[PDB]
Design an enzyme around this catalytic site. Structure first.
Site, PDB file in Angstrom:
ATOM      1  N   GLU A  35      35.114  28.782  42.697  1.00 24.31           N
ATOM      2  CA  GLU A  35      34.670  29.620  41.584  1.00 24.31           C
ATOM      3  C   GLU A  35      34.401  31.060  42.016  1.00 24.31           C
ATOM      4  O   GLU A  35      34.775  32.007  41.310  1.00 24.31           O
ATOM      5  CB  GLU A  35      33.430  28.985  40.959  1.00 24.31           C
ATOM      6  CG  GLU A  35      33.700  27.681  40.203  1.00 24.31           C
ATOM      7  CD  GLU A  35      34.457  27.883  38.880  1.00 24.31           C
ATOM      8  OE1 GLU A  35      34.674  29.038  38.449  1.00 24.31           O
ATOM      9  OE2 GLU A  35      34.893  26.866  38.299  1.00 24.31           O
ATOM     10  N   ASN A  46      36.547  36.780  30.489  1.00 21.55           N
ATOM     11  CA  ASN A  46      37.393  35.795  29.823  1.00 21.55           C
ATOM     12  C   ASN A  46      38.115  36.419  28.635  1.00 21.55           C
ATOM     13  O   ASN A  46      37.709  37.448  28.103  1.00 21.55           O
ATOM     14  CB  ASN A  46      36.549  34.608  29.338  1.00 21.55           C
ATOM     15  CG  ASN A  46      35.806  33.913  30.468  1.00 21.55           C
ATOM     16  OD1 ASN A  46      34.593  33.695  30.411  1.00 21.55           O
ATOM     17  ND2 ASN A  46      36.537  33.557  31.491  1.00 21.55           N
ATOM     18  N   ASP A  48      38.219  35.461  25.570  1.00 19.60           N
ATOM     19  CA  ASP A  48      37.432  35.489  24.342  1.00 19.60           C
ATOM     20  C   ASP A  48      36.314  36.521  24.357  1.00 19.60           C
ATOM     21  O   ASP A  48      35.553  36.586  23.387  1.00 19.60           O
ATOM     22  CB  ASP A  48      36.847  34.101  24.051  1.00 19.60           C
ATOM     23  CG  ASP A  48      35.807  33.648  25.071  1.00 19.60           C
ATOM     24  OD1 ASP A  48      35.422  34.431  25.961  1.00 19.60           O
ATOM     25  OD2 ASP A  48      35.355  32.495  24.972  1.00 19.60           O
ATOM     26  N   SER A  50      33.766  36.663  26.564  1.00 17.75           N
ATOM     27  CA  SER A  50      32.623  36.237  27.342  1.00 17.75           C
ATOM     28  C   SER A  50      32.881  36.587  28.807  1.00 17.75           C
ATOM     29  O   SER A  50      33.979  36.965  29.187  1.00 17.75           O
ATOM     30  CB  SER A  50      32.399  34.744  27.145  1.00 17.75           C
ATOM     31  OG  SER A  50      33.492  34.004  27.670  1.00 17.75           O
ATOM     32  N   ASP A  52      31.887  35.290  33.000  1.00 12.71           N
ATOM     33  CA  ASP A  52      31.344  34.317  33.948  1.00 12.71           C
ATOM     34  C   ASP A  52      30.599  35.011  35.096  1.00 12.71           C
ATOM     35  O   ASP A  52      31.075  36.017  35.628  1.00 12.71           O
ATOM     36  CB  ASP A  52      32.479  33.479  34.533  1.00 12.71           C
ATOM     37  CG  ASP A  52      33.211  32.678  33.504  1.00 12.71           C
ATOM     38  OD1 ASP A  52      32.670  32.395  32.441  1.00 12.71           O
ATOM     39  OD2 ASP A  52      34.358  32.300  33.763  1.00 12.71           O
ATOM     40  N   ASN A  59      28.990  30.852  32.154  1.00  8.52           N
ATOM     41  CA  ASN A  59      29.595  31.632  31.084  1.00  8.52           C
ATOM     42  C   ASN A  59      28.577  32.085  30.039  1.00  8.52           C
ATOM     43  O   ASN A  59      27.675  31.335  29.664  1.00  8.52           O
ATOM     44  CB  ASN A  59      30.687  30.787  30.416  1.00  8.52           C
ATOM     45  CG  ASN A  59      31.407  31.528  29.328  1.00  8.52           C
ATOM     46  OD1 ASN A  59      31.124  31.347  28.147  1.00  8.52           O
ATOM     47  ND2 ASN A  59      32.340  32.378  29.715  1.00  8.52           N
TER      48      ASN A  59
END
Ligand SMILES: [Cl-]
Ligand SMILES: [Cl-]
Ligand code: NA
Ligand code: NA
Length: 129
Positions: A35, A46, A48, A50, A52, A59
């Site tokens: 990650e 991301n 959309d 959002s 992380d 998220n």
């Protein structure tokens, strides 16, 4: 902070993640490697809108508030910036909520695709724990 492999394993063990909800320590270390490459400051945006955050790439649509993800929940009740600290407590406490929500560690795409079904014990081999 960029952790070493065994340093992070030890920190995660002290924070109660070894066998948390049945996931052995190597699963958590493997997930952190893919990650974030063990970097607490990692961020990724991301499609959309959002973002992380942190060593476990938590998220902002569901779990933390970053002031720029409209319609988001803050289910861990924390600003997303708290997840970037050299102290992993806030990331670990939130990850415990995530892994308990029904889908286990499949919530982390990199765990499903690169750790699940592999010899995850190798991630803690050689560490003094
Ligand atoms: Cl393990
Ligand atoms: Cl992946
Ligand atoms: Na180390
Ligand atoms: Na949010």
């Amino acid at each position: 902070k960029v952790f070493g492999r065994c340093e992070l394993a030890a920190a995660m063990k002290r924070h109660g993640l070894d066998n948390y909800r049945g996931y052995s320590l190597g699963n958590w270390v493997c997930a952190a490697k893919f990650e974030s490459n063990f970097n607490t400051q990692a961020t990724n945006r991301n499609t959309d809108g959002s973002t992380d955050y942190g060593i476990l790439q938590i998220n902002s649509r569901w779990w933390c508030n970053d002031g720029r993800t409209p319609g988001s929940r803050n289910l861990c009740n924390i600003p997303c910036s708290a997840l970037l600290s050299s102290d992993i407590t806030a990331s670990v406490n939130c990850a415990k909520k995530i892994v308990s929500d029904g889908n286990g560690m499949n919530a982390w795409v990199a765990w499903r695709n690169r750790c699940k079904g592999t010899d995850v014990q190798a991630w803690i081999r050689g560490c003094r724990l």
